[PDB]
Structure 1
Amino acid sequence: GFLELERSSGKLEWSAILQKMASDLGFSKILFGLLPKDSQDYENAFIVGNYPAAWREHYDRAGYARVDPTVSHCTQSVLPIFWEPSIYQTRKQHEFFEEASAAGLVYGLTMPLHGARGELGALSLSVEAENRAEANRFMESVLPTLWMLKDYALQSGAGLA
């Protein structure tokens, strides 16, 4: 439910709930990340979820925030960007893709977060599918629910980053 999210007290409880709503919706890995107004400090964003630790580490250390095409997207758009070959346009972005894939992030989307007080962030979710046609079918069945979720997550989570 969306209400357990808003009425949850701490960071552990809130992120636990967001993460179970995400698995219950059928997503495997989740990242919620949020920055205050006018910050581009991606190495110091509020970040919760279940991305493997080694991958989050590589990401920060290699400076992927500057490369990751979903980052520049969130900056200019409120619409989701699905993780497709298309979005990986330069060749550093291709390297980025072969690494994410090796870390298990192949099918998925990133929902941009733009808060009432100027917050900037992203909710990203992975899908385990035997392929991208099954993965889109799945995504298309959950989108409206997810779209609501990302907003409840931003409103309630903004008050604790």
Structure 2
Amino acid sequence: GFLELERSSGKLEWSAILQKMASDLGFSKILFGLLPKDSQDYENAFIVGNYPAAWREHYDRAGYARVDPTVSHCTQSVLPIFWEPSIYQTRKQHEFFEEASAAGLVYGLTMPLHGARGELGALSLSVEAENRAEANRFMESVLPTLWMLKDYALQSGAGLAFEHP
């Protein structure tokens, strides 16, 4: 199923395919973000997915890239960070989690992306669940496949974002 990502032509089809693959793994909302090597801001970012517009706008306007604990995590690790007030510490981080929750994004994980040419990014995925224990069971159940998916998305996504005409 992974070959479909490479086979696709255009940001639209590629995003639709990734969203569908994520949905099949139990995740209703995803965000794929990728920056060029040594990017100093977000001007040149490639960001696609189905997170709600209002949340995307608010995150930007509130400067949450400097608050969201997953951002710094991604600069330090190749391993996923699960969304837990716990990775929250500060007042603004409590605010961030409260607002994410209100936006419907409560349980999930962020998988760091580190490309062969120094690309830096993240594949973030939200899972709908009754509670955290259930969310954790849903996520653990698909983790091996998601682990493959994130690398296929990185390899094909970097090409689509930064290379292919």
TM superposition score category, shorter chain reference: over 0.9
- Provide closer, same or farther for how the CA distance between residues 73 and 14 of structure 1 changes in structure 2, counting only shifts above 3 A: same
Sequence identity percentage: 100
Q: Which moved more, 1:83-92 or 1:42-51?
A: 42-51
Given that residues 107 and 127 in structure 1 are in contact (C-alpha distance below 8 angstroms), is that contact kept between their aligned partners in structure 2? Answer: yes
* Structure 2 match to 1:103: 103
Task: Find the aligned partners of 1:44 and 1:29 in 2 and give their Cα distance.
Answer: 23
SS in 2 for 1:123: strand
Given that residues 29 and 127 in structure 1 are in contact (C-alpha distance below 8 angstroms), is that contact kept between their aligned partners in structure 2? Answer: yes
Given that residues 30 and 124 in structure 1 are in contact (C-alpha distance below 8 angstroms), is that contact kept between their aligned partners in structure 2? Answer: yes
Q: Deviations for 1:96-144, whole angstroms, at most 9, x for unmatched residues?
A: 0000000011000000000011000000000000000110011100000
Q: Deviations for 1:37-87, whole angstroms, at most 9, x for unmatched residues?
A: 001323652110000001100111111101110000001100000001110
Task: Find the aligned partners of 1:22 and 1:42 in 2 and give their Cα distance.
Answer: 24
Task: Find the aligned partners of 2:52 and 2:35 in 1 and give their Cα distance.
Answer: 21
Task: Find the aligned partners of 1:115 and 1:50 in 2 and give their Cα distance.
Answer: 23
Given that residues 43 and 60 in structure 1 are in contact (C-alpha distance below 8 angstroms), is that contact kept between their aligned partners in structure 2? Answer: no
- Provide closer, same or farther for how the CA distance between residues 61 and 89 of structure 1 changes in structure 2, counting only shifts above 3 A: same
Shift of 1:160: 1.4
- Provide closer, same or farther for how the CA distance between residues 133 and 43 of structure 1 changes in structure 2, counting only shifts above 3 A: farther
How well do the aligned residues superpose, as a CA RMSD in angstroms? Answer: 0.9
* Structure 2 match to 1:129: 129
Task: Find the aligned partners of 2:44 and 2:115 in 1 and give their Cα distance.
Answer: 18
Shift of 1:8: 1.0
* Structure 2 match to 1:114: 114
Given that residues 74 and 113 in structure 2 are in contact (C-alpha distance below 8 angstroms), is that contact kept between their aligned partners in structure 1? Answer: yes
SS in 1 for 2:75: helix
**TM-score, scaled to structure 1:** 0.97
Given that residues 42 and 65 in structure 1 are in contact (C-alpha distance below 8 angstroms), is that contact kept between their aligned partners in structure 2? Answer: no
Given that residues 36 and 44 in structure 2 are in contact (C-alpha distance below 8 angstroms), is that contact kept between their aligned partners in structure 1? Answer: no
- Provide closer, same or farther for how the CA distance between residues 128 and 43 of structure 1 changes in structure 2, counting only shifts above 3 A: farther
- Provide closer, same or farther for how the CA distance between residues 147 and 51 of structure 1 changes in structure 2, counting only shifts above 3 A: same
**TM-score, scaled to structure 2:** 0.95
Aligned length in residues = 161
Which aligned runs of 4 or more in structure 1 are off by greater than 6 angstroms?
none
Task: Find the aligned partners of 1:52 and 1:40 in 2 and give their Cα distance.
Answer: 26
